[PDB]
Design an enzyme around this catalytic site. Structure first.
Site, PDB file in Angstrom:
ATOM      1  N   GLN A   1       0.851  -1.228   0.000  1.00  0.00           N
ATOM      2  CA  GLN A   1       0.000   0.000   0.000  1.00  0.00           C
ATOM      3  C   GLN A   1       0.870   1.255   0.000  1.00  0.00           C
ATOM      4  OE1 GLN A   1      -3.320   0.315  -0.374  1.00  0.00           O
ATOM      5  NE2 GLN A   1      -3.133   2.554  -0.264  1.00  0.00           N
TER       6      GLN A   1
ATOM      7  N   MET B   1      -3.079  10.447  -4.303  1.00  0.00           N
ATOM      8  CA  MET B   1      -2.892   9.031  -3.959  1.00  0.00           C
ATOM      9  C   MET B   1      -2.740   8.148  -5.204  1.00  0.00           C
ATOM     10  SD  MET B   1      -2.723   9.067  -0.668  1.00  0.00           S
ATOM     11  CE  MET B   1      -2.924   7.361  -0.162  1.00  0.00           C
TER      12      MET B   1
ATOM     13  N   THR C   1      -3.279   4.439  -6.057  1.00  0.00           N
ATOM     14  CA  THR C   1      -2.290   3.501  -5.446  1.00  0.00           C
ATOM     15  C   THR C   1      -2.011   2.335  -6.385  1.00  0.00           C
ATOM     16  OG1 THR C   1      -2.959   4.020  -3.164  1.00  0.00           O
ATOM     17  CG2 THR C   1      -1.805   1.919  -3.520  1.00  0.00           C
ATOM     18  N   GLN C   2      -0.730   2.037  -6.588  1.00  0.00           N
ATOM     19  CA  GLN C   2      -0.328   0.884  -7.385  1.00  0.00           C
ATOM     20  C   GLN C   2       0.883   0.214  -6.751  1.00  0.00           C
ATOM     21  OE1 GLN C   2       1.047   3.865  -7.819  1.00  0.00           O
ATOM     22  NE2 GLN C   2       1.165   4.382 -10.005  1.00  0.00           N
TER      23      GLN C   2
END
Ligand SMILES: *[C@@](C)(CO)[C@](*)(O)[C@H](Cc1ccccc1)NC(=O)[C@H](Cc1ccc(OC)cc1)NC(=O)[C@@H](C)NC(=O)C1=CC2=CCC=CC2=C1C
Ligand SMILES: [Mg+2]
Lengths: 222, 235, 233, 195, 211, 231, 240, 244
Positions: A1, C107, C1-2
């Site tokens: 994450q 993000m 997010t990745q």
């Protein structure tokens, strides 16, 4: 994450004199156990005889400073080149910080300058916008190491006058700029010894009616 | 028909010029700036004797250090006053200080030209914005529906404006006291008004650094009217 | 997010008396698989800047296009595009830094660590770092990933502080960089022997060296090493 | 909040609601009135999550008062209860539902009958002779099942209600600081000041 | 924190401590937990410092605009409701703010408790913060409506002291206020270190502690 | 005539009358002069008052430390356009750490004004601007017209009676361009230029407004007793 | 959306659409407002061209905005419903956010603000309605009577009339109403309100509506017989 | 631009009238007459179809009388297409009210809602108003039997007896003459048909040129029944009253 936050270390220190103010900070920038830079300026002259440092997560600190510097610029445009007083700057910064109440600027901010009566002023913030005017404040990694030292050596806490035995306190005599700079250098030398994120260099910005002056001092590089 | 934001061949916006004609039909309002304070006075102009004159509110507080008088389509002023009050208190929220009179006036004048095809037409009301700040001291501004604002030592707006402005041309000097300015507003109002001036059909107000913005009582104004009559009869 | 997929490892750099040097290997890893062996991770912008990128390669190719488009856009209605109003290293960096910090604030970061090396109009050396978090810093030596841990210590022995920069020649700096790349090949499991090196000098301009190899390697002592403790044969 | 009870007798509806309000480990108030008058002959008590209860009740109150002014007419208790149910049924599938349970006690002036409606936060409505929310029913319904008649007087309704509160005070672990009792009948709404 | 406020015959007393914490670390020895909204309105603070400052200063903006529009001071009841409505907009978004709105209006002295859940309670006595239980103990056993201004000020002062002593996250100093029909009156900053020893001797309390 | 009702209508000869009427508003406005050397650039503006009790309307606006303009026509429109420049100058600094080129600033103003001349509902800007600045290619002076046309010049003037000052500058071209490293002499040439557009009235202390920018000189405005030196 | 500027200035500085909205008010039935010492009375004309009307269910001319405030009007009937609805919503909205009922002055200011908004908003025309708003503020025994008009201006009145032949009844009120000594009782206040309408109405049968508003939310509407007694007494004194 | 072609449907005349509303009323005056009469024990709705043909399928036709719910019905005068738009909206409003309060919608509330929609088209949006006038016949437990009318202005009023469409001036005079308060449904039926028979522009009033309906408490015990008359039933009531 993905973690959007980080910790670039560092420590800052603001002290208000009778007719002056200082804002000091180490010049070391770090991630985890590595050093990024031994000299990365952290305290800035923002104009109108105001100095500022946002310590914690450098990206958020650089963004905040950049935004406040911009706020000062637009204050001049909108209000006929009026000087932004230190109390007005403090309130403006509160609103910059609380604009991200739900995605905070991860920084402990301090500004220093002179109030409208010419006396020394320091203002302290938390990451979400609470602020107040203070005489003495250390912020950042080694804040907990330094603050008690300042309570003792600046505000003369737990210090009484010999012979009376605890009946009469030590009187609160003001400090000169030369005496303050000694307490700043000894604060950072002590912090450098016991805190791994503190070191390399020390940069102090002194604010008087004459303007903003800089002083640089080397620190241990280990 | 034709656009609302159309230029005339002379290089003027038709609608702005037409709104100025509506302001000429309005009741007289006068402002005089001195080093002891700024005085604001208005003609109430009740359409009937049954109309309770004290409910005619053509002088209005914006902040403790800024007041405002109006002339023209006075209903249009309510949203401008609301914006001014909000702007004044919002700046106090952001900067922990009083807002400059000029900056307040500029904020009001920014609304002016926000019309097109935003609101559908310009405002049909002119404002005399009077106040005090630490930087520029006692100030009087004239805010028009064109978006332009001029600072004035003394200014009259409304139906008897050009006659009153000529009178203000001769009477104003830089050493005027507050008491002298009060009588001067009453004098010129009495000159241009249709009906006979008294405490019920005319209102006074002022702004000082100490006491801030104050609207004058009818009892207080009545004494200044009686003081005026005697000094005019004195020579 | 990745998460990053195809990745590039360390990018290292340092200042010397008349300019800056930057270097990075030509590998595109797919986890532990050394998948792509012909990847250029140093990208010149004009004749005064080289951007070195580590991290996700798809995001690198995206940045590569942003820079190519930046040059095109700067030339628009600009008669001084190849002179006074040409792109500066500081302009290119601040643009990237703005992009990186905006993306992290949404993000949805560009999973990279970037070093912009170049020489300004006035001859001043430019060397600054930026990453996926929008964190920026400058130093006489800069390095990403493993280079931060192994290369910087070696490069800081040549230029430990600002005052050592005028005393450092291009031959000494290049030698230090090439030695650092060898050390990384010994010790970084996601590195390759083949690499590219770029020098931006205020006098001689931009020199871009391709198809370099790590040489003069020490392996002979391996023959004597036997077992993991008690074994003699 | 904690406990809200309701009982419908011959000619009136009686609502009893606890007085306690707690934040953290401290009882901040012991005289809280967990009720709002929706109309002259309709009373709504409420219990649920902090803050949501009063906000919801006042929102309902405003809507019914708006209806009364517009039509110059009082809505029947049945109509009000249906309106309230729909708002709660609308609420449960919202982004953040209002966590409020209510009892609606009203006197229908048209039919000359008292009416008690129990509605939970999901929008589950039931007309009852006596009702409660949360754990209150676990202790009290056995007493009400035994003693309740439909021809009871208001005074007998209060005596049966006292017995219910005494049982709660004996067997509940929580101190709810007694109850405020209100009576809804043909003459309107009044509070029993001594209970 | 520990804050308290109570109504009585001669108005309302408001007393707060001045400590601020960041875990076990005492981040501030002297923070102002009272806001002077206007000459007749006060607001106590407990919870997230930033939330308390931002929203109560935003309340002051809104209470000031009320005066300009209506030419009359806002009531304590209406002021407390504006604040509770602000809390309901950011319902469940994670704010932390416990406050008492103290003042004097046409109905006499007024006191309302408001928290982040949108709760709004009227009452004669309240106390918020990590040390409210300690303050309630002293208040409940010594409070009367017939208190003199001198005795009332001391009660609020002594009640904070009780909490400052026992509660680890309360202390520093005591800020006192007294609200009358002519407005609020500040009754000074009182260091707990000095106040404790003074009260111990004069009152005879804290017998267990050695001094 | 029939083709001047809105900005979206060409006349039979290919003219846009609403734009021409907006251009007329500039001619009614008070005179302002612009001129530059290789080191400095100067704005000189004749301010106008409503009457003797009124103040003199400000003509010069600062956009950045290195750029600013003077206006002639509708003042509110100048406030809108100057605000746009302030934002664009500021976008260049915050994003690219780059001072906005004066030529690029002109291109942005041109494009902003153009959109208002081709769409229905809106109107052209009713103001002309003289932009001065010092960037990486030295000193600059631009003339903006609300038709969209922006022009880089050595010197110029706009407003009422501006033809007189423009002729003077056209004669003095070779002289004032060479005034390098001498701000006071360059201002003198600007004050002498604007004087050619005066009738009846003369330059007083609260009438004259001057601004300057240069190599080691941030954009600064001079009003009041600060310009008494040049009267 | 439809954004057309309908209310605009003319060369002579007039907004014709607002002025033509006043002509719609001039066409409307007469409404009158008179405030006594301890009360306010609202009188309203009912044109007798419409018979076979069901007076039980026909929209009454006087409308309650809250329990303590009332609103009568002159002009377009359909337009008035929109203002009344908005006013009623604002009255409950004020109670909900401030915990006090609206003052009569506040409610008037809101209704006047709505009328004003429709004079400088795109795609809309002004309300062809003037209102008389009357009542008593919470915990106050001083009577309140305000007037609004399409332009959005409002003001307080000791006594006022609007609608058709309002010029005549205003003339009557100006000479009959004494400020130093207003109608001391309810009877005197109603009598003066009926007298004023009898100058214009025609027949004193079902053409006159009266609504008395007293302090502390005490609002009642008089019946036909009660009003008819006032009509009888007035004319019998007139025969002299 | 587009301004050139805008008729400006929502403006005042110099006299303070709404042009489009007045012209819509002029349209309605040419529509077939509709009459409503309220009695003590019920309501009658009678309406005249406009110049029909022999090949028009009457038994499946509906141009005048529409059912809004079980308690409320309307008679139409004007553009039928416009009326159907409004009717479907009113049907939905009645069901929304029933779903919310679990009670049938009061007649006036439904009437006010439709009248508010008509009002909106005269004040904003720049669209033409609905060229429709309604007569509402309904019952509820508050006011009992009720007659209302609404017109394109959005103004509505209550009535004991009323006509809309063509010849309302003549029709209203005849109703005002013969109507009495103690009247009953059977008498009201006769009055409605007699009034149409005298005001009609046709040569003679026949069953195929009429739509008829009653709302009666003449249903088994305390409840209300709507009766939309069939062609054969209209023929019978015409013979009964002595018109054909
Ligand atoms: C008790 C001390 C409980 O800790 C109080 O409730 C106090 C209230 C209060 C303090 C300052 C101003 C107004 C009200 N609360 C706190 O001090 C609060 C405790 C806390 C911590 C964290 C959360 O969220 C999980 C809630 C409550 N502490 C803080 O908010 C911290 C973050 N404040 C500071 O660190 C801080 C405030 C501050 C103000 C001015 C100058 C410097 C300041 C700092 C460093
Ligand atoms: Mg160290």
């Amino acid at each position: 994450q993905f973690n959007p936050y980080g910790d670039n270390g560092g420590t800052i220190l603001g002290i208000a004199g009778e007719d002056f103010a200082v804002l000091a900070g180490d010049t070391r920038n770090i991630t985890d156990y590595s050093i990024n830079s031994r000299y990365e300026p952290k305290v800035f002259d923002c104009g109108d005889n105001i100095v500022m440092s946002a310590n914690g997560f450098a990206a958020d600190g650089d963004a905040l400073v950049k935004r406040f510097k911009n706020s000062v610029k637009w204050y001049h445009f909108d209000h006929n080149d009026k000087k932004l007083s230190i109390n007005s700057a403090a309130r403006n910064i509160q609103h910059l910080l609380y604009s991200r109440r739900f995605f905070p600027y991860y920084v402990y901010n301090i500004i220093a300058g002179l109030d409208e009566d010419g006396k020394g002023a320091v203002y302290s913030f938390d990451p979400v916008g609470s602020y107040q005017r203070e005489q003495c404040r250390a912020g950042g990694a080694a804040a907990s190491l330094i603050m008690p030292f300042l309570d003792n050596q600046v505000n003369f806490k737990n210090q009484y006058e010999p012979g009376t035995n605890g009946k009469v306190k030590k009187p609160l005599k003001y400090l000169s700029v030369e005496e303050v700079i000694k307490l700043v250098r000894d604060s950072f030398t002590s912090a450098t010894e016991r805190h791994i994120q503190v070191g390399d260099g020390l940069e102090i910005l002194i604010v008087t009616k004459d303007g903003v002056r800089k002083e640089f001092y080397e620190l241990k590089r280990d | 028909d034709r656009g609302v934001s159309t230029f005339s061949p002379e290089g003027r916006l038709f609608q702005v010029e037409y709104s100025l004609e509506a302001i000429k039909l309005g009741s007289t309002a006068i402002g005089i700036a001195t080093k002891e304070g700024v005085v604001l006075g208005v003609e109430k102009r009740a359409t009937s004797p049954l109309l309770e004159s004290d409910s005619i509110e053509k002088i209005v507080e914006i902040d403790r250090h800024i007041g405002c008088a109006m002339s023209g389509l006075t209903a249009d002023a309510r949203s401008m006053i609301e914006h001014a009050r909000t702007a004044a208190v919002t700046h106090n929220l952001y900067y922990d200080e009083d807002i400059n009179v000029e900056s307040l006036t500029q904020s009001v004048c920014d609304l002016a030209l926000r019309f097109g095809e935003l609101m559908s037409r310009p405002f049909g009301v002119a404002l005399l914005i009077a106040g005090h700040d630490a930087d520029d001291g006692y100030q009087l501004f004239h805010a028009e529906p064109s978006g332009t604002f001029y600072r004035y030592n003394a200014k009259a707006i409304g139906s008897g404006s050009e006659g009153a402005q000529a009178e203000l041309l001769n009477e104003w000097h830089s050493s005027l006291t507050l008491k002298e300015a009060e009588l001067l507003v009453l004098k010129i109002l009495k000159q241009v008004m249709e009906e006979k001036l008294d405490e019920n059909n005319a209102q006074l107000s002022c702004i000082t650094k100490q006491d801030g913005f104050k609207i004058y009582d009818n009892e207080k104004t009545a004494e200044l009217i009686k003081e005026l009559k005697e000094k005019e009869a004195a020579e | 997010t990745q998460q990053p997929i195809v990745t590039g490892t360390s990018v290292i750099s340092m200042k010397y008396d008349n300019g800056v040097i930057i270097a990075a290997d030509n590998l595109g890893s797919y986890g532990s698989l050394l998948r792509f062996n012909g990847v250029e991770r140093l990208i010149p912008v004009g004749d005064n800047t080289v951007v070195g990128i580590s991290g996700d390669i798809s995001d690198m190719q995206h940045i590569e296009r942003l820079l190519k488009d930046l040059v095109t856009e700067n030339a628009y209605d600009n008669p001084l595009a190849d002179a006074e109003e040409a792109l500066e290293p500081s302009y290119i960096f601040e643009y990237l830094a703005t992009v990186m910090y905006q993306r992290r604030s949404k993000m949805n970061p560009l999973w990279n660590a970037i070093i912009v090396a170049g020489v300004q109009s006035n001859g001043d050396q430019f060397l600054r770092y930026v990453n996926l978090l929008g964190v920026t810093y400058s130093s006489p030596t800069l390095a990403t990933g493993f280079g931060a841990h192994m290369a910087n210590p070696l490069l800081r022995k040549v230029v430990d502080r600002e005052s050592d920069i005028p005393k450092t020649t291009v031959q000494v700096a290049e030698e230090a960089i090439v030695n650092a790349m060898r050390v990384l090949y010994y010790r970084d499991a996601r590195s390759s022997r083949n690499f590219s090196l770029a020098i931006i000098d205020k006098n001689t301009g931009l020199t871009f060296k391709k198809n370099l190899q790590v040489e003069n390697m020490k392996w002979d002592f391996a023959k004597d090493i036997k077992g993991y403790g008690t074994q003699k044969i | 909040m904690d406990i809200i009870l309701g009982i419908r007798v011959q000619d009136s509806v009686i609502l009893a609601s606890s007085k306690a309000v707690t934040r953290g480990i401290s009882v901040l108030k012991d005289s809280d009135d967990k009720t709002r008058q929706l109309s002259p002959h309709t009373l709504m008590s409420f219990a649920g999550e902090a803050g949501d209860t009063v906000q919801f009740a006042e929102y309902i109150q405003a809507n019914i008062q708006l209806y009364s002014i517009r039509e110059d007419y009082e809505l029947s208790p049945q109509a009000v209860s249906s309106f309230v149910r729909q708002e709660l049924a609308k609420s449960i599938r919202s982004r953040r539902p209002y966590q409020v349970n209510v009892l609606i006690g009203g006197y229908d002036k048209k039919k000359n009958k008292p009416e008690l409606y129990q509605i939970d936060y999901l929008g589950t409505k039931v007309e009852l002779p006596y009702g409660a929310h949360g754990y209150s029913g676990f202790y009290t319904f056995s007493l009400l099942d035994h003693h309740y008649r439909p021809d009871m007087t208001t005074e007998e309704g209060l005596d049966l209600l006292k017995l219910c509160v005494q049982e709660l005070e004996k067997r509940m672990p929580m101190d709810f600081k007694g109850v405020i009792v209100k009576i809804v009948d043909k003459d309107g709404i009044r509070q029993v000041d001594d209970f | 924190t520990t804050t308290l406020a109570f109504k009585f015959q001669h108005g309302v007393i408001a007393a707060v401590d001045s400590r601020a914490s960041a875990g076990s670390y005492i981040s501030a020895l002297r923070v102002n937990k009272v806001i002077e909204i206007n000459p007749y309105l006060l607001g106590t603070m407990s919870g997230c410092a930033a939330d308390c400052q931002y929203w109560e200063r935003l309340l002051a903006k809104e209470c000031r605009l009320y005066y300009l529009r209506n030419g009359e001071r806002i009531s304590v009841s209406a002021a407390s409701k504006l604040l509770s409505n602000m809390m309901c907009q950011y319902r469940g978004m994670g704010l932390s703010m416990g406050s008492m709105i103290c003042g004097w209006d046409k109905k006499g002295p007024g006191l309302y408790y408001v928290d982040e859940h949108g709760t709004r309670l009227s009452g004669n006595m309240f106390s918020t913060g990590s040390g409210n239980t300690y303050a309630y103990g002293v208040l409940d056993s010594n409070y009367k409506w017939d208190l003199s201004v001198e005795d009332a000020l001391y009660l609020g002062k002594r009640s904070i002291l009780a909490a400052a002593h026992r509660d680890a996250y309360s202390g520093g100093s005591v800020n006192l206020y007294h609200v009358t029909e002519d407005g609020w009156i500040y009754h000074g900053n009182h260091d707990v270190g000095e106040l404790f020893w003074k009260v111990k001797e004069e009152e005879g309390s804290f017998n267990n502690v050695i001094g | 005539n029939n083709y001047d009702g809105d900005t979206v209508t060409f006349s039979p000869t290919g003219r846009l009358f609403q734009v021409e009427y907006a251009l007329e508003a500039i001619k009614q406005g008070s005179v302002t002069v612009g001129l530059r050397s290789n080191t400095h650039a100067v704005l000189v503006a004749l301010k106008r008052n409503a009457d003797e009790l009124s103040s003199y309307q400000k003509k010069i606006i600062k956009c950045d430390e290195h750029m600013g303009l003077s206006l002639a026509g509708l003042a509110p429109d100048a406030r809108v356009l100057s605000n746009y420049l302030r934002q664009q100058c500021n976008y260049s600094s915050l994003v690219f750490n780059r001072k906005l080129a004066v030529e690029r600033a002109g291109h942005l103003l041109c494009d902003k004004a153009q959109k208002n001349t081709q769409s229905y509902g809106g109107r052209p800007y009713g103001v002309g601007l003289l932009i001065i600045g010092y960037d990486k290619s030295g000193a600059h002076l631009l003339e903006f017209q609300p038709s969209g046309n922006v022009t880089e010049l050595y010197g110029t003037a706009i407003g009422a009676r501006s033809q007189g000052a423009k002729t003077y500058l056209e004669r003095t071209l070779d002289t004032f361009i060479k005034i390098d490293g001498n701000p006071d002499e360059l201002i003198k040439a600007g004050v002498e230029a604007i004087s050619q557009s005066l009738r009846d009235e003369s330059l007083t202390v609260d009438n004259l407004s001057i601004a300057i920018v240069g190599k080691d000189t941030p954009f600064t405005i001079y009003d009041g007793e600060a310009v008494a030196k040049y009267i | 959306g439809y954004d057309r500027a309908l209310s605009i200035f003319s060369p002579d500085g007039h907004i014709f659409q607002v002025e033509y909205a006043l002509e719609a008010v001039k066409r409307g039935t007469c409404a009158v407002g008179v405030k006594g010492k301890n009360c306010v009375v609202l009188g309203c004309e009912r044109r007798s061209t419409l018979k076979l009307q069901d007076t039980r269910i026909t929209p009454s001319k006087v409308s309650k905005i809250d329990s303590h405030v009332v609103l009568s009007f002159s002009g377009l009937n359909a337009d008035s419903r929109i203002l009344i609805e908005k006013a009623r919503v604002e009255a409950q909205s004020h109670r909900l956010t401030l915990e006090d009922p609206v003052t009569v002055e506040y409610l008037t200011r809101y209704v006047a603000g709505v009328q004003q908004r429709y004079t400088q908003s795109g795609g809309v025309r002004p309300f062809g309605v003037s209102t008389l708003i009357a009542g008593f503020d919470p915990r106050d025994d001083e009577p309140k009577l305000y007037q609004t008009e399409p332009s959005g201006i409002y003001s307080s009145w000791s006594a006022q009339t609007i609608g058709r032949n309002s010029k005549t009844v205003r003339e009557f009120l100006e000479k009959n109403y004494d400020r130093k000594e207003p109608p001391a009782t309810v009877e005197e206040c109603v009598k003066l309100t009926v007298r004023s309408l009898l100058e214009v109405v025609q027949t004193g049968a079902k053409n006159i509506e009266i609504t008395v508003v007293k302090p502390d939310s005490d609002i009642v509407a008089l019946s036909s017989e009660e009003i008819n007694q006032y009509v009888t007494q007035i004319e019998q004194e007139k025969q002299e | 631009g587009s301004r050139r072609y805008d008729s400006r449907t929502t403006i005042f005349s110099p006299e303070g009238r709404l042009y489009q509303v007045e012209y819509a009323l002029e349209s309605i005056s040419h529509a077939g007459t509709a009459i409503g009469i309220m009695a003590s024990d019920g309501i009658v709705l009678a309406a005249e179809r406009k110049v029909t043909s022999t090949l028009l399928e009457q038994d499946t036709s509906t141009e005048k009388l529409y059912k809004l719910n079980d308690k409320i019905a309307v008679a139409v005068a004007g553009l039928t297409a416009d009326a159907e738009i409004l009717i479907n909206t009113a049907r939905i409003h009645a069901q929304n009210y029933l779903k919310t309060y679990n009670e049938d919608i009061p007649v006036e509330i439904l009437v006010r809602r439709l009248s508010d929609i008509k009002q909106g088209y005269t004040q904003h949006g720049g669209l033409r108003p609905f060229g429709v006038s309604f007569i509402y016949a309904g019952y509820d437990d508050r006011y009992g039997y009720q007659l209302y009318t609404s017109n394109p202005s959005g103004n509505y009023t209550g009535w004991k007896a009323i006509s809309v469409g063509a010849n309302t001036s003549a029709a209203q005079t005849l109703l005002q003459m013969d109507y009495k308060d103690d009247m009953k449904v059977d008498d009201a039926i006769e009055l409605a048909l007699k009034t149409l028979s005298k005001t009609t522009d046709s040569s003679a009033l026949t069953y195929d040129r009429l739509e008829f309906a009653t709302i009666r408490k003449g249903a088994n015990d305390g409840e209300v029944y709507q009766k939309i008359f069939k062609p054969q039933e209209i023929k019978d009531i015409l013979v009964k009253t002595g018109i054909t």
